[PDB]
Write an enzyme that holds these catalytic residues in place. Structure first.
Site, short mmCIF file in Angstrom:
data_model
loop_
_atom_site.label_atom_id
_atom_site.label_comp_id
_atom_site.label_asym_id
_atom_site.label_seq_id
_atom_site.Cartn_x
_atom_site.Cartn_y
_atom_site.Cartn_z
N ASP A 176 0.52 -1.27 -0.20
CA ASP A 176 0.22 -0.21 0.04
C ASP A 176 0.79 1.42 0.32
O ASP A 176 1.59 1.59 1.29
CB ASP A 176 -1.14 -0.44 1.38
CG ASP A 176 -1.91 0.83 1.35
OD1 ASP A 176 -1.34 1.86 0.10
OD2 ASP A 176 -2.97 1.46 1.83
C1 LIG Z 1 -11.53 2.11 0.03
C2 LIG Z 1 -11.10 3.03 1.10
N1 LIG Z 1 -9.80 2.28 1.02
C3 LIG Z 1 -8.85 2.24 1.61
O1 LIG Z 1 -8.69 2.92 2.08
C4 LIG Z 1 -7.22 1.19 2.11
N2 LIG Z 1 -6.40 2.11 2.10
C5 LIG Z 1 -5.74 2.96 1.50
O2 LIG Z 1 -6.12 3.33 0.97
C6 LIG Z 1 -4.93 3.24 2.28
O3 LIG Z 1 -4.50 3.64 1.70
C7 LIG Z 1 -4.87 4.53 3.28
C8 LIG Z 1 -5.47 6.02 1.75
C9 LIG Z 1 -6.13 7.31 3.45
C10 LIG Z 1 -5.34 8.14 4.26
C11 LIG Z 1 -5.73 9.02 4.59
C12 LIG Z 1 -7.59 9.29 4.32
C13 LIG Z 1 -7.93 8.77 3.71
C14 LIG Z 1 -7.41 7.25 2.51
N3 LIG Z 1 -4.01 5.27 3.95
C15 LIG Z 1 -4.12 5.01 5.11
O4 LIG Z 1 -5.24 5.12 5.62
C16 LIG Z 1 -2.72 5.56 5.89
N4 LIG Z 1 -2.46 6.44 7.04
C17 LIG Z 1 -1.52 7.52 6.40
O5 LIG Z 1 -1.01 7.63 6.54
C18 LIG Z 1 -2.00 8.70 7.75
N5 LIG Z 1 -0.90 9.46 8.30
C19 LIG Z 1 -2.58 10.42 6.49
C20 LIG Z 1 -3.52 11.24 6.88
C21 LIG Z 1 -3.51 12.36 6.33
C22 LIG Z 1 -3.37 12.10 4.81
C23 LIG Z 1 -2.55 10.86 4.26
C24 LIG Z 1 -2.21 9.95 5.53
C25 LIG Z 1 -2.75 3.77 6.99
C26 LIG Z 1 -3.69 4.30 8.52
C27 LIG Z 1 -3.08 2.85 6.35
C28 LIG Z 1 -1.44 3.89 7.81
C29 LIG Z 1 -5.68 1.62 3.60
S1 LIG Z 1 -7.62 0.45 4.32
C30 LIG Z 1 -7.79 -0.39 2.84
C31 LIG Z 1 -9.39 -0.93 3.21
C32 LIG Z 1 -7.12 -0.81 2.51
C33 LIG Z 1 -10.97 3.90 0.02
C34 LIG Z 1 -11.61 4.76 0.14
C35 LIG Z 1 -8.87 4.48 0.03
C36 LIG Z 1 -11.02 3.61 -1.26
#
Ligand SMILES: C[C@@H](NC(=O)[C@H]1N(C(=O)[C@@H](O)[C@H](Cc2ccccc2)NC(=O)[C@@H](NC(=O)[C@@H](N)c2ccccc2)C(C)(C)C)CSC1(C)C)C(C)(C)C
EC number: 3.4.23.-
Lengths: 116, 116
Positions: free
Chosen positions: A32
């Site tokens: 990711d």
């Molecule tokens: C269905 C969603 N899928 C997902 O979100 C998938 N993920 C992803 O797509 C990740 O790359 C996610 C992207 C993201 C970062 C900040 C706000 C919103 C989205 N990254 C995070 O959530 C990561 N959070 C962070 O890196 C955090 N420090 C941050 C704060 C503000 C702006 C960028 C990053 C982490 C908790 C996994 C370390 C992690 S969990 C997942 C299900 C595998 C969507 C809405 C992004 C399509």
């Protein structure tokens, strides 16, 4: 290797994780590039084990308690490179048991995104 | 191009996004192998347009109300390739403005991850 990108198919990898608090274990982790920090399940750790609280921002909103921070570095072994990633600190998912290789780990094995 | 991965620099690209609901706009977007589906900020849509309710699971937990699904395809042009990515449907951030290019988009660029 080269990992193709498909919306229908999470890019995953078999990683062996040593938390240093019980024996190393294999997990399937999500590769990711939008994760700042790697996330590993609490299932890897022992019921003892001090872990710090930590605020984490995701798509789901902000969370105070779902994720904790590691006390000790975490060693990760990928199937190809003989030499371990050593993350000084990384996140621990206490709610679900997600496994997410983030850019901390990907930098250390010189991963790149390539867009033709 | 080759985009290095580094936990302190989020991997971004300038993308021109056509919602087909108002003038196309260039925005900065995160390149995200962990995202199934691209996310576009609600600001790039007319106040008029029908959007579909959707539930989204992400690091912060579950959200019923934070994201909407689009009604018209979205066209995305990246600074190097002449032909637009066309997404049948993608997510809309009704709040805090996120712009996330996910694997739907990255598949159409022939995007890949390389791990040596
Ligand atoms: C269905 C969603 N899928 C997902 O979100 C998938 N993920 C992803 O797509 C990740 O790359 C996610 C992207 C993201 C970062 C900040 C706000 C919103 C989205 N990254 C995070 O959530 C990561 N959070 C962070 O890196 C955090 N420090 C941050 C704060 C503000 C702006 C960028 C990053 C982490 C908790 C996994 C370390 C992690 S969990 C997942 C299900 C595998 C969507 C809405 C992004 C399509």
């Amino acid at each position: 290797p080269v990992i193709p990108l498909d919306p229908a198919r999470r890019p995953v990898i078999k990683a062996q994780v040593d938390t240093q608090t019980s024996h190393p274990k294999t997990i399937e982790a999500l590769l990711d590039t939008g994760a700042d920090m790697t996330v590993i399940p609490i299932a890897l750790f022992s019921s003892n084990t001090p872990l710090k609280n930590t605020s984490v921002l995701g798509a789901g909103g902000q969370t105070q308690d779902h994720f904790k921070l590691t006390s000790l570095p975490v060693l990760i072994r990928l199937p190809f490179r003989t030499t371990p990633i050593v993350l000084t600190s990384c996140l621990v998912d206490t709610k679900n048991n997600w496994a997410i290789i983030g850019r901390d780990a990907l930098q250390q094995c010189q991963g790149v995104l390539y867009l033709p």
